[PDB]
Amino acid sequence: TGRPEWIWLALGTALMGLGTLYFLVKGMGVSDPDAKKFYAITTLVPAIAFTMFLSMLLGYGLTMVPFGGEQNPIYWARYADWLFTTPLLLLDLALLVDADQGTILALVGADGIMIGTGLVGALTKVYSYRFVWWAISTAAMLYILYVLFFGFTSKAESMRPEVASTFKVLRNVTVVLWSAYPVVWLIGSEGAGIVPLNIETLLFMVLDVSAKVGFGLILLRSRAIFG
Numbered sequence: 001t002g003r004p005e006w007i008w009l010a011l012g013t014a015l016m017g018l019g020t021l022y023f024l025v026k027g028m029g030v031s032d033p034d035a036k037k038f039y040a041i042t043t044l045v046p047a048i049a050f051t052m053f054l055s056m057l058l059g060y061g062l063t064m065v066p067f068g069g070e071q072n073p074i075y076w077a078r079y080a081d082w083l084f085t086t087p088l089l090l091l092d093l094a095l096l097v098d099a100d101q102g103t104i105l106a107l108v109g110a111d112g113i114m115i116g117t118g119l120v121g122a123l124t125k126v127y128s129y130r131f132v133w134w135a136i137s138t139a140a141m142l143y144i145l146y147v148l149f150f151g152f153t154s155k156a157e158s159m160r161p162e163v164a165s166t167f168k169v170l171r172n173v174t175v176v177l178w179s180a181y182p183v184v185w186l187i188g189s190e191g192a193g194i195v196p197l198n199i200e201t202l203l204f205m206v207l208d209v210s211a212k213v214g215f216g217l218i219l220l221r222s223r224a225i226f227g
């Protein structure tokens with residue numbers, strides 16, 4: 001009966017599910033208050049992803065948008081996942097380096113703009129204006145990456161070296177993974193239409209699992225989260 005990207009939505013669901021269960025069991029077993037905060041934020045991340053992957057697998061979160069002369073499938077539920085999960089990831093990073101309150105507000109604001117303007121782009125009917133929204137979104141993304149690379153690293157230098165070195169691995173993972181998203185959007189079913197929907201779903205699933213479960217495994221096994 002159903003669409004060919006179903007298999008990657010199914011594999012996504014299973015990996016986000018097992019990662020959530022694993023983080024939950026390890027988290028409930030620790031007593032340190034600082035570690036526990038990291039566990040709570042980091043378990044919630046793949047939990048939200050699991051629910052959105054499951055919804056899309058069962059045929060929700062999907063709409064048709066007319067552009068370029070034809071009717072194009074667009075998965076909007078992805079944006080509902082990212083709207084909450086991307087700022088939770090940034091909060092992990094900010095807590096790890098003791099970032100200022102004003103910095104966090106600015107980053108979460110920027111992140112909201114990135115996801116909101118990405119979604120507006122995805123839903124826009126005049127082909128060339130899709131890319132105006134994409135460009136605004138990518139600018140907001142680049143501001144985030146600049147602040148993580150220059151501002152957060154400088155804050156990390158005032159921490160003990162094992163905290164600084166955990167931050168640097170997470171930072172490097174984040175910059176590499178996050179910088180690929182605007183490229184997948186540009187060339188896939190939301191932008192140019194070159195890479196088909198099934199392969200695009202495969203790419204976003206690998207990126208998402210790496211950015212959430214991978215990131216999580218690295219953070220939650222470090223000594224850096226302990227009080």
Ligand SMILES: CCCCCCCCCCCCCC(=O)OC[C@H](COP(=O)([O-])OCC[N+](C)(C)C)OC(=O)CCCCCCCCCCCCC
Pocket residue numbers: 128129131132135136138139186192
């Ligand atoms: C990360 C941020 C960096 C990117 C920022 C700028 C990059 C340089 C892009 C400029 C190229 C476009 C200029 C052009 O060349 O001509 C103008 C083009 C004609 O468009 P129009 O005749 O429909 O009316 C438009 C008139 N109006 C807007 C009032 C309705 O202005 C447009 O629309 C607007 C489309 C341009 C903005 C989005 C850039 C395209 C990005 C990549 C596209 C990739 C293709 C695979």
Ligand SMILES: *C/C=C(C)/C=C/C=C(C)/C=C/C1=C(C)CCCC1(C)C
Pocket residue numbers: 082085086089114115118119134137138141178179181182185208211212
């Ligand atoms: C768990 C999900 C993660 C870590 C997702 C990150 C998603 C982005 C960095 C998305 C960025 C986008 C742009 C830069 C422009 C166009 C569309 C967006 C949402 C895909």
